[PDB]
Amino acid sequence: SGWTFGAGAALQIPFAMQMAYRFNGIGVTQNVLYENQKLIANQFNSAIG
Amino acid sequence: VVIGIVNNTVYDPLQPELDSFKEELDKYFKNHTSP
Amino acid sequence: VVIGIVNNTVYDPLQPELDSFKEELDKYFKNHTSP
Ligand SMILES: *[C@@H]1O[C@H](CO)[C@@H](O[C@@H]2O[C@H](CO)[C@@H](O[C@@H]3O[C@H](CO)[C@@H](O)[C@H](O)[C@@H]3O)[C@H](O)[C@H]2NC(C)=O)[C@H](O)[C@H]1NC(C)=O
Ligand SMILES: *[C@@H]1O[C@H](CO)[C@@H](O[C@@H]2O[C@H](CO)[C@@H](O)[C@H](O)[C@H]2NC(C)=O)[C@H](O)[C@H]1NC(C)=O
Ligand SMILES: *[C@@H]1O[C@H](CO)[C@@H](O[C@@H]2O[C@H](CO)[C@@H](O)[C@H](O)[C@H]2NC(C)=O)[C@H](O)[C@H]1NC(C)=O
Ligand SMILES: *[C@@H]1O[C@H](CO)[C@@H](O)[C@H](O)[C@H]1NC(C)=O
Ligand SMILES: *[C@@H]1O[C@H](CO)[C@@H](O)[C@H](O)[C@H]1NC(C)=O
């Protein structure tokens, strides 16, 4: 549900396109996530291990 | 390259101010051909 | 539906362009009007 559940009703959102909202708030356009969706996932999967 | 892309049409916004001008620009070409 | 709205004119940025391109075509269109 993203951050929407801490500020009212809870609205769902696909997780693949929720990181695009977090990337947008940093200063990088949201296209760079979809270009490297597989590369970013492996970096997060490996760093959590 | 992106996963989940879908097919659709993106509306050109120059055309609405030019499609009416297509009845103007192209017709002006045809405006003097016949006479 | 808006309280306090006012009347004015919003000049499109294509207005100098139409006076330089559309009118240039019109100038070209008017060039063949006399003959
Ligand atoms: C911005 O411009 C528009 C259009 O020029 C103005 O709308 C016009 O407002 C007048 C108000 O007096 C309308 O006159 C009305 O005429 C009817 C009869 O048709 C009469 O029964 C009413 O008592 C009134 O006198 C006029 O029709 C109307 N024109 C259009 C095209 O809607 C508008 O008032 C202007 N903005 C401001 C803040 O004045
Ligand atoms: C950007 O950095 C990432 C992270 O190192 C690079 O991905 C690695 O690239 C090497 C080079 O072949 C591979 O051996 C690794 O397996 C890659 N890591 C993963 C998790 O896939 C990526 O190549 C870099 N991009 C550029 C353009 O240099
Ligand atoms: C979206 O449109 C493209 C463009 O036609 C589709 O790509 C075609 O895919 C078929 C396979 O079923 C190929 O035989 C065609 O040659 C492709 N077209 C081109 C121009 O290469 C694409 O399949 C469409 N997306 C979906 C989900 O149907
Ligand atoms: C053709 O040109 C004349 C001006 O000579 C104009 O009045 C007329 O509207 C034009 N025709 C069209 C279809 O716009
Ligand atoms: C108008 O047409 C004549 C005829 O060929 C040409 O010589 C002249 O250059 C044209 N005018 C413009 C502004 O192009």
Give the three-state DSSP class for C3: coil
Give, in order, the Cα–Cα distances in Å from C22 to each of A32, A42, B8, B15, B16.
40, 55, 31, 14, 15
- Evaluate whether B22 touches C22 at the Cβ level (below 8 Å): no
Please provide the size of chain C in residues: 35
- Evaluate whether C25 touches B28 at the Cβ level (below 8 Å): yes
Angle between helix C23-31 and B14-33 (nearest 10): 0
CA of A44 relative to ligand 2 center, distance in Å: 13
- Evaluate whether A23 touches A30 at the Cβ level (below 8 Å): yes
Containing H/E element for A33?
A: helix A31-35
Which are the contacts of A4, defined by CB distance < 8 A and separation ≥ 6? Answer: A10, A11, A13
- Evaluate whether A20 touches A33 at the Cβ level (below 8 Å): yes
Q: Is the CB of B31 under 6 A from ligand 4?
A: yes
Is A37 within 8 Å of chain B by CB?
yes
Is B13 within 8 Å of chain A by CB?
no
Resolution (A): 3.3
Q: According to the entry, how was the structure determined?
A: cryo-EM
Q: Which residues of A touch B4 (CB under 8 A)?
A: 16
- Evaluate whether B25 touches C25 at the Cβ level (below 8 Å): yes
Token pair of B27 as six digits: 């017709």
